[PDB]
Design a binder for this molecule. Structure first.
Ligand SMILES: Nc1ccn([C@H]2C[C@H](O)[C@@H](COP(=O)(O)NP(=O)(O)OP(=O)(O)O)O2)c(=O)n1
Ligand SMILES: [Mg+2]
Ligand SMILES: [Mg+2]
Length: 430
DNA sequence: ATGATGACGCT
DNA sequence: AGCGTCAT
């Protein structure tokens, strides 16, 4: 009736940088612009592991996780940029500093939630209201939306991409109800005008291009952001959800990419997100637990309430290095020396963090992985973090892990360690 | 033999 | 506290 809650209460955007680490290298090195290129770490192993790929290289099939020597078999002209190395390990400082540039611009428009090194959610609900007051009642012109796609449009009675975009935008604007300031579709439209400006400001002020999703919640905004990458934004309205979800594989919705999504698919015998609507909430809660069941029931209807959190800073700061296979650490002073390397990089980052952000970490988390063991982390142990001192931190990390040494011999380390990981957590104002 | 990270749920 | 999942 008049109480059916539609999940149209908010305007939320997700902004995500196109091939971010590649754009950072291309801004620095003009020779790599508008060319197939990739960013790699560790040149020694098969040319390096690829961690970011430009769209011109994607057209040859180059992907992340590929070795650079194999990528060159698909794309012989592929240009590479390699990540800085310090203290024997990959150092991502350049990309974190580029991330700060973007996050600071977006913060001028609205409350943002930093979601990764290259993306942030934006609650635009308030700015949409303000903007709607300011705009008397003047219609919204297609010229305000020069890079916006309206998902699901055009429909009903042009063979090139820009042609299709415009007709869908014209259809949307033609039907839009501009003298009725509570319509969620109007609010999304105004939200998309603001995200055009935010994206123009990012590119003008950093030279970085990006894509965006505009919708009513984080999940839809994230989904919408990927529909028309690169350098384009997509509005997913509440009404577009049934058709969009009818052929949307379950694994594409955020948090359904892993084991949970696989069991939804296998337990229910379904493929697409919209098929979930067939099930009562209690049924979904019986199969997947009370929170997953409630979430799924609403999400397959386009409704989700996870808020955009006001957080632009990480809660943790971490350094880790893998020692796969034959390089697994197997002597005590090898473990000590790498812990000192990690502690030294971490202390540099913490000190910068304390000066920029006026806070200190108070807990140190050591994590390790031993050979054979199957999981991301074999074992985590915590101690106090009272001094930004690299030697103290690596001393304390060794202290709390050294009893994992199954080794009989004095100087040996058994079983060999395939991963070390130092993390600073439990930040407090300073 | 991608790796280097980060957020958060569960018990 | 320590372990597990999901993510870029
Ligand atoms: N597994 C991953 C995924 C991304 N990244 C880094 C490199 C990416 O450039 C950056 C952002 O990831 P994305 O997942 O946002 N990829 P980008 O490379 O940003 O591509 P598009 O977002 O244009 O598809 O994070 C990473 O190091 N390891
Ligand atoms: Mg991106
Ligand atoms: Mg991203």
């Amino acid at each position: 009736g008049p109480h059916m809650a539609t999940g149209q209460d908010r305007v939320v955007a997700l902004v995500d940088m196109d091939c971010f680490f590649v754009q950072v290298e291309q801004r620095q090195n003009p020779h790599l612009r508008n060319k197939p290129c990739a960013v790699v770490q560790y040149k020694s192993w098969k040319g390096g592991g690829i961690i970011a790929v430009s769209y011109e290289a994607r057209a040859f099939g180059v992907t992340r996780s590929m070795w650079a020597d194999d990528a060159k078999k698909l794309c012989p002209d592929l240009l590479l940029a390699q990540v800085r190395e310090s203290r024997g390990k990959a150092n991502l400082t350049k990309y974190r500093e580029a991330s700060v540039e973007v996050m600071e611009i977006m913060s001028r428009f609205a409350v943002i939630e930093r979601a990764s090194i290259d993306e942030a959610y934006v609650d635009l609900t308030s700015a949409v209201q303000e903007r709607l007051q300011k705009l008397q009642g003047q219609p919204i012109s297609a010229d305000l939306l020069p890079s916006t796609y309206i998902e699901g449009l055009p429909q009903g009675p042009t063979v090139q991409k820009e042609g299709m975009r415009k007709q869908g935008l014209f259809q949307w604007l033609d039907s839009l109800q501009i003298d009725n300031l509570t319509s969620p579709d109007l609010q999304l439209t105004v939200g998309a005008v603001i995200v055009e400006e935010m994206r123009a400001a990012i590119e003008r002020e950093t030279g970085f291009q990006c894509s965006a999703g505009i919708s009513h919640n984080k999940v839809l905004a994230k989904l919408a952001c990927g529909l028309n990458k690169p350098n384009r934004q997509t509005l997913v309205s509440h009404g577009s959800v049934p058709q969009l979800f009818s052929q949307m594989p379950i694994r594409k919705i955020r948090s359904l990419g892993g084991k949970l999504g696989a069991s939804v698919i296998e337990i229910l015998g379904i493929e697409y997100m919209g098929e979930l609507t067939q099930f009562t909430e209690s049924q979904l809660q019986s199969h997947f637990g009370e929170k997953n069941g409630s979430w799924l029931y609403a999400m397959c209807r386009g409704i989700e309430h996870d808020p955009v959190k006001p957080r632009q800073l990480p809660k943790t700061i971490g350094c880790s290095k893998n020692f796969p296979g034959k390089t697994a650490l197997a002597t005590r002073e090898q473990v000590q020396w790498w812990l000192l390397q990690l502690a030294q990089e971490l202390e540099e980052r913490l000190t910068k963090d304390r000066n920029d952000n006026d806070r200190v970490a108070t807990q140190l988390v050591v994590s390790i992985r031993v050979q054979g063991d199957k999981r991301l982390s074999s074992l985590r142990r915590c101690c106090a973090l009272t001094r930004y001192d690299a030697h103290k931190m690596s001393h304390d990390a060794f202290t709390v892990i050294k009893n994992c040494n199954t080794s009989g011999i004095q100087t040996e380390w058994s079983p060999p360690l395939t991963m070390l990981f130092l993390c600073a957590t439990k930040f407090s104002a300073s």
